[PDB]
Enzyme design. Sequence first.
Site, PDB file in Angstrom:
ATOM      1  N   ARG A 104       1.104  -1.169  -0.028  1.00  0.00           N
ATOM      2  CA  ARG A 104      -0.174   0.317  -0.367  1.00  0.00           C
ATOM      3  C   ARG A 104       1.001   1.068  -0.131  1.00  0.00           C
ATOM      4  O   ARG A 104       2.074   0.729   0.065  1.00  0.00           O
ATOM      5  CB  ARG A 104      -1.056   0.373   1.092  1.00  0.00           C
ATOM      6  CG  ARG A 104      -2.263  -0.800   1.051  1.00  0.00           C
ATOM      7  CD  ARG A 104      -3.191  -1.169   1.743  1.00  0.00           C
ATOM      8  NE  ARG A 104      -3.869  -2.447   1.864  1.00  0.00           N
ATOM      9  CZ  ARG A 104      -2.767  -3.201   2.168  1.00  0.00           C
ATOM     10  NH1 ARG A 104      -1.970  -3.591   2.585  1.00  0.00           N
ATOM     11  NH2 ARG A 104      -3.752  -4.558   1.976  1.00  0.00           N
ATOM     12  N   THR A 214     -15.741  -9.486  -4.957  1.00  0.00           N
ATOM     13  CA  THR A 214     -15.140  -7.893  -5.017  1.00  0.00           C
ATOM     14  C   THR A 214     -16.115  -7.208  -6.499  1.00  0.00           C
ATOM     15  O   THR A 214     -15.723  -7.521  -7.603  1.00  0.00           O
ATOM     16  CB  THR A 214     -13.418  -8.684  -5.173  1.00  0.00           C
ATOM     17  OG1 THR A 214     -13.122  -8.753  -4.223  1.00  0.00           O
ATOM     18  CG2 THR A 214     -13.475  -7.128  -5.922  1.00  0.00           C
TER      19      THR A 214
END
Lengths: 417, 413, 420, 417
Positions: A104, A214
Amino acid sequence: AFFQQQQLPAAMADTFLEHLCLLDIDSEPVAARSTSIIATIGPASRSVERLKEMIKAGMNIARLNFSHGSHEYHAESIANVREAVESFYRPVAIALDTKGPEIRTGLSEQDVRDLRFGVEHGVDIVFASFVRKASDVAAVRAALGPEGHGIKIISKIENHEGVKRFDEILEVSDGIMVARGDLGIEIPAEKVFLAQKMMIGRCNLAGKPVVCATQMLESMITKPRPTRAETSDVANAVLDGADCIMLSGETAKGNFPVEAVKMQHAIAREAEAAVYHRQLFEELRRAAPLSRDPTEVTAIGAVEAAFKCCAAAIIVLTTTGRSAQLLSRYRPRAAVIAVTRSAQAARQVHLCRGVFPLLYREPPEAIWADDVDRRVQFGIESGKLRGFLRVGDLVIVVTGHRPGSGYTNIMRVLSIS
Amino acid sequence: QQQQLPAAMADTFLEHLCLLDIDSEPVAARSTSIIATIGPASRSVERLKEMIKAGMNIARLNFSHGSHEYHAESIANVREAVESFASYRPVAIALDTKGPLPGLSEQDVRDLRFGVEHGVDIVFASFVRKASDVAAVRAALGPEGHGIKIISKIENHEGVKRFDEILEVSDGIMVARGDLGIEIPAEKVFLAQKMMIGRCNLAGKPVVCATQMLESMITKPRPTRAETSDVANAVLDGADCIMLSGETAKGNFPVEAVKMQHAIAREAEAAVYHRQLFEELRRAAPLSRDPTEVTAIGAVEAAFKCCAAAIIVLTTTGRSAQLLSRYRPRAAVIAVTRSAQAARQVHLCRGVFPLLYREPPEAIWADDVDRRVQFGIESGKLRGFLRVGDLVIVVTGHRPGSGYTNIMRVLSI
Amino acid sequence: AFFQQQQLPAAMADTFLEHLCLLDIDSEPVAARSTSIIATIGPASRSVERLKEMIKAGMNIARLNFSHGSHEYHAESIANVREAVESFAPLSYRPVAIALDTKGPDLPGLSEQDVRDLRFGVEHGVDIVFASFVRKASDVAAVRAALGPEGHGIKIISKIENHEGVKRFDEILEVSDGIMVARGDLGIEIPAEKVFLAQKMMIGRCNLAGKPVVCATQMLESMITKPRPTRAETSDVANAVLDGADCIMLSGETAKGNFPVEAVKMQHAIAREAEAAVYHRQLFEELRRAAPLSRDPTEVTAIGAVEAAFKCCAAAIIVLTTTGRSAQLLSRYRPRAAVIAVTRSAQAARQVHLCRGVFPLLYREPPEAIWADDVDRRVQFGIESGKLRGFLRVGDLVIVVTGHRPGSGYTNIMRVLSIS
Amino acid sequence: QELGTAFFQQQQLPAAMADTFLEHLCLLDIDSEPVAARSTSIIATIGPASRSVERLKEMIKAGMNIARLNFSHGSHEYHAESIANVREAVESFYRPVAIALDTKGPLSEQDVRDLRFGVEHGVDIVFASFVRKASDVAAVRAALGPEGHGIKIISKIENHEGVKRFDEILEVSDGIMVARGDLGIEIPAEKVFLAQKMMIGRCNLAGKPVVCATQMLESMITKPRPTRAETSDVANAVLDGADCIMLSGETAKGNFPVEAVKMQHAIAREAEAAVYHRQLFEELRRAAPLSRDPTEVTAIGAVEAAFKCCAAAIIVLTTTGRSAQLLSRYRPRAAVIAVTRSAQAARQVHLCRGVFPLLYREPPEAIWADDVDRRVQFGIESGKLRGFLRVGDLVIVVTGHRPGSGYTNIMRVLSIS
């Protein structure tokens, strides 16, 4: 009159193409929605009020995303779920989704602390990120420890290696998540659907649960009504075979979490009816192995029996959930009402399409046959109250023959009165 | 072990699915045609040339907005972009009417007459509820528009419920999921879709899936996972055409959206389970004493028996090419036609690859047939359809003028 | 190992054509022979000693042909059959049903003589009537009225012998207990080259409907004088079993020929080979697919039980039944597994022989006070008899099908079980 | 519609269109008159009862297509005379009749003289006795010599080893006889039907002719009508897949040789209609390997074509009969009318069910395309005259593209005018 509904005309067709041609938008679904809904917990879905609304709407499993937020943040998510459930019985399973080796802006030391926090707080399921081979699953089972041996491990397939090595991975997992977000970046977006249909296929053959995840209703993060590709994607995931469908942003951060849940409930119920069981049942039957497990054999005779009479439900007594899981792999139209004394089995069994758990809390009757029949009566009174059973219905009752047999090896056909 | 062949040869659907393979590369030509809506993002000749390279087969004119002048500019712009590759790809032009009770409004008629005067190939007729609505459209197109195909848009409940009657008088169907998802509950539109594509497949008539397929590419350069699912599955349901609306009319990524539908289509087409599909379409189909049908089916049987690279068909109107396509052959249907309009319109049929033939007819008719076949073979070799030593099926007429395509021969390259 | 036997390679084939191509003459049949053998009684087969050899060879139903012979002659035949049967009262007791085949003839369809014959049959306790020249449902009803009230348990098997009975078949079958394809007369009333169409149709529809069908007449004709049948004749027996027949029949071969015992034996040997060659994967699927939905708990238990037996290679389905019915409903799905029907009704132990694959065990112990003790006891009796007879081995799996409630007639419980 | 109203109730078409085998049987109708041309060939053994040229003409009229000479008995001069009377009966009427020599067997010194005699007198087929392995067939091919290269070898499977070594024998044989007589002694009588259905199935899949033989109508040796088992036995042999059925004592020594032939014709015609092509053709198709033989590719497309339009015939030009054979393995309901310049090919094609040979004797037109067409018109005139064809029928024409190609690789759909 009965037969116009739940796409029965399409269900009778003799070819798949005639099945499609017979789908009817005026054939209302009758049966309880059976594909379970996984909702990711986030700022939009942390309030206890909000969590109750999302339970009336259909959420069966709360997902904790350990990519974001501290242990204390998630302990609070866990707390609000459990308080929403026990402020109404509809149990809700709790699922820990590991951060995994995520960048991230193998198994890490953080994943291992997270998995131990998970056991500490009694989570029912682990969604294990970036499973690429069977030893990754073991690493997780180890981490959970001997104290987390009852926790199910759903392995997330997110990249080419996991897709390649899938058979090995399925052979050691309790189940699978088709984790389409990372997968659609790690392999080409246009190839995900092949991997999804394959893994759902292989999972339905194995009798193990499979999760579609998702972006299924992505646009409902900001809009109150989904797009046509999204409703299609929910419907097709159910038609593909999936046991669970999932919401991520739609419930964690978006503005319409309850509506998102409701929408997956509506699409799921229509698509369950459009299932073409006659072909599906025949293909599972032909391909599945002969079996000398009395529970497997009762399961398939019980499902067959249910189709012959349009049974409203199969009532099964289970302790670990396995007997209901073996009914569920044959995709009965009838509801699988699983009566259990294990509240953690009751939660976990929401991983299996078509299983509606009842938690049974009376001490054991002195005479076992009286106990069995008392739990069955529980099953029927519940199903009557909750709208599963009407007087005059047939139900198939699956149970064991003697106590501690380990086998649910008796089937009984029965009229609700 | 390319083209999903292990999964094509599974003995059941369940096993076909379990054998789908992300590594099995598709090598046949993409066969489902891509309709792209024209708008400010796709109007320029330079944009249209980029789209054609990307895969655009049919340009859609949305007459819900824009003047006759603006659409006449759009038409001239497509035609220029096309002719600038004369890699020649005919591109059909389709007029999607405004509609709304009258099957046609005052304005719709003016639009229809505009479209006839500008040579459009296709009409998407809005809010078709019953056969009389189709007939109105066809009267409005009058005598000079007889060759234009009418693809009725089913957008509401009456139209679903009266579907069979619309199909029988339409040249085709569009599943117009935008209005349909409002006119009936949204959770039901997959049912209406799966039904109509199935019925259109069984009747051998082209069916279009429309609207919000890649909707998020209007602002983003990659689609969502639902959107790729939606396109792949529409191809698996049986659609002949998939459509792009805002994604090419106004979005920031028109070319990329066309590309993305190209990429998904190809993969989905390989995943088709022809074995079940061909058999079910031959079972459910009906006896026919039309030689062109009979030849078509015998020809598709032959092509599967020998993994033919293609079926080469000489067609004047496109019919023989459509009758081939209704059986979903794995092999490309290469359609050799002198009719420019038929080379454009056959893009309504999955798997039909038009080659326009411009030579002056040969004095000897058997020579004229053979020259057109060789043209198919060479252009097929040139484009990648056919290698030496492939097997092709050839489908032609017996005598000059008969109006029938009743001969098939098996041939090596 | 086990999978080289009873044409299991051929049964696992994915197509009929592939099944055919995998039939293996070396693959021995190990199941019990399950198509029942009807033997016509006559001067060659009347003696108690002759009948004992026939029971030993496989006779399951004795047929009394009332086209000849006096009431007194047939009363002797009956007594002789019952004596021979009593001679074996475990390993060798074999119930044998007695069937009365009427003499028969716009005509009335019950001659004045037929009524006397049917009243005779009731008075003497016959189990089955084969009713000649049934043309229409009222013919069957005539026969049931002739049998009067004492005769309500006798099964009626309508003989289809001419064009009209073929054409009104569905009407007849609906009110009959079963059918005989009476090919002798039928081969005269319609061109002989069409009889196989009628036979194959009628067996198909009775399989569909769950009702017994008998293939009859000239099946091993030449064994009347020869000790071995012709190649056409063994083919006829094998194909009748493959068509779906519940019973195969012998007429002159046992009534008047020189080789009555050998003919029974030979029908026994062919039937066993043919049963193993049945393609159950296709046949079970087509039967449930075409069978309609049902809300009869015994029906529903039955199909669940055959599904279960198939899934586990069950050596047997053990079913307690009072009337044969729950046995008959197992039978109509053609389980590869033997259907062992434990019953207290002597008449039902005889009559289930109309049903392919049902092996009756007569249970004579007095009830147990505890009704669930009585159920367990009858189930055990079946397990041991099965082990004593080769049906069952230690470690085999069986499906047990019973009632829940001492008083209803429903076999609505199935249990899966190891032999130990 | 264009075809009659009777059309769809005749030929067991209601049964033919049933969706399952079981429903097909349930719809067999004794009033559905067979209309199509009987297609299974009838082999008749020549003997005292069938040596008269009168007798033989009636037998041809009754349906005999092949004369079997049984060299277990009778001298060479005896068989020469039989061969002679068969040929005179033919050319005193055009119906080709093939002549087949059936070896005495137990390759002996005697069989060798017999096969050479057989070449000398131009026999069309050899039924070779007790074939036990592929080498046995080579001994027969050798004995025939170079002057017998065109003779077909049909291998008699008569004992266990032949059954077990069947695949290797079928690999070198033009065809197979299931010789039930000796087989019913060498293996238990009650197993022969297993061998028969196995062998016919493997020959059907392999595209090679198979003959069912012995005791099919045995009682007609002395009785004018057959038993119910015999009629059933012919019918089921045709339903098993047999290309030919045989008569032995019934024609060679019995008192009703012409009746026997007639009864086989009648039974065979009914049973051909009762075939369930829908399943048969699909099984042959997904069992048969892919192919790059143009003639073969054209065959299956022409057969599929003829089923789609209820074609009354498939008219095929063939020089050896192979293109007609290859149509015949798919078991068209339409008659396969095979036009050939080879008289030996016209005789030999009676080995293949459904092939109806026409001998064409004109000299080749200078323009091949005219020669082809002229031959096709010969097929169509011949077909009309005998009731195969009528104005308004569709036929499927199968021919070559360039003369001398060696592939029949064009089909045309064609109205009969």
